[PDB]
Design an enzyme around this catalytic site. Structure first.
Site, PDB file in Angstrom:
ATOM      1  CG  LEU A 281      39.104  53.997  51.037  1.00 31.60           C
ATOM      2  CD1 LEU A 281      39.812  53.799  52.375  1.00 31.60           C
ATOM      3  CD2 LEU A 281      40.117  54.151  49.906  1.00 31.60           C
TER       4      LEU A 281
ATOM      5  CB  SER B 214      51.410  39.306  37.801  1.00 28.89           C
ATOM      6  OG  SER B 214      52.378  39.693  38.761  1.00 28.89           O
TER       7      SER B 214
ATOM      8  CG  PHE C 107      36.425  45.426  45.691  1.00 28.92           C
ATOM      9  CD1 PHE C 107      36.715  45.375  47.043  1.00 28.92           C
ATOM     10  CD2 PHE C 107      35.134  45.764  45.306  1.00 28.92           C
ATOM     11  CE1 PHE C 107      35.759  45.697  47.992  1.00 28.92           C
ATOM     12  CE2 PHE C 107      34.169  46.085  46.249  1.00 28.92           C
ATOM     13  CZ  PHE C 107      34.483  46.058  47.594  1.00 28.92           C
TER      14      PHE C 107
ATOM     15  CG  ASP D 246      41.701  49.721  55.133  1.00 32.33           C
ATOM     16  OD1 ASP D 246      42.603  50.098  55.908  1.00 32.33           O
ATOM     17  OD2 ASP D 246      41.634  50.111  53.946  1.00 32.33           O
TER      18      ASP D 246
ATOM     19  CD  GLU E 274      37.135  43.740  51.122  1.00 32.56           C
ATOM     20  OE1 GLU E 274      37.304  44.408  52.174  1.00 32.56           O
ATOM     21  OE2 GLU E 274      38.018  43.638  50.242  1.00 32.56           O
TER      22      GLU E 274
ATOM     23  CG  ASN F 254      55.337  37.590  38.976  1.00 35.17           C
ATOM     24  OD1 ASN F 254      54.544  38.532  38.896  1.00 35.17           O
ATOM     25  ND2 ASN F 254      56.645  37.744  38.824  1.00 35.17           N
TER      26      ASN F 254
END
Ligand SMILES: c1ccc(CCSc2cnn[nH]2)cc1
Length: 162
Positions: A32, A117, A104, A20, A11, A132
């Site tokens: 965010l 998955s 996250f 972002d 990040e 996948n």
């Protein structure tokens, strides 16, 4: 390596409001603020989150505190989610970091798309799970970050971050 170091790599750190990869107002270590196009709306969210009038700018200490809250919220969300918790609890510590990383970044609204998955991960079919996981908007839109997370699920090592 731990979840904080991993997400700090993925990040970065910015002390002023930025956008972002999706164009949404964000600050700090990927916090965010809002999906609204209004910068004023983002500034209100920031002031509420920090508890003072920030003018769109925070300190490193404040960014790190928000980050700790955000990591904890991701973990607690996993533990409260009936689909995610059994898979998370089946994983080793390194792969649990990969799981937190995904939550996250993406939250929980798209958990159902990852049903297959998740089954492959719980079955410890690591190569199949990695294939996948890459069949996703996530991988196509942020491929280098997704490749690091997927390599972490595939290998159970920190090799992609070293
Ligand atoms: C265990 C728990 C979570 C994960 C990633 C979550 S599957 C998903 C959740 N939100 N978006 N996609 C993987 C193993």
């Amino acid at each position: 390596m731990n979840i904080f170091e991993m997400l700090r790599i993925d990040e970065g750190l910015r002390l002023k409001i930025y956008k972002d990869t999706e164009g949404y107002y964000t600050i700090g270590i990927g916090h965010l603020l809002t999906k609204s196009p209004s910068l004023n709306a983002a500034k209100s969210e920031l002031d509420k989150a920090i508890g003072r009038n920030c003018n769109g700018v925070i300190t490193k200490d404040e960014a790190e505190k928000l980050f700790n809250q955000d990591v904890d919220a991701a973990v607690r969300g996993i533990l409260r989610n009936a689909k995610l918790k059994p898979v998370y609890d089946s994983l080793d510590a390194v792969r649990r970091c990969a799981a937190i990383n995904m939550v996250f970044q993406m939250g929980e609204t798209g958990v159902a798309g990852f049903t297959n998955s998740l089954r492959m991960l719980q079955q410890k079919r690591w190569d199949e799970a990695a294939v996948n996981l890459a069949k996703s908007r996530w991988y196509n839109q942020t491929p280098n970050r997704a490749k690091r997370v997927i390599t972490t699920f595939r290998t159970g090592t920190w090799d992609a971050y070293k």
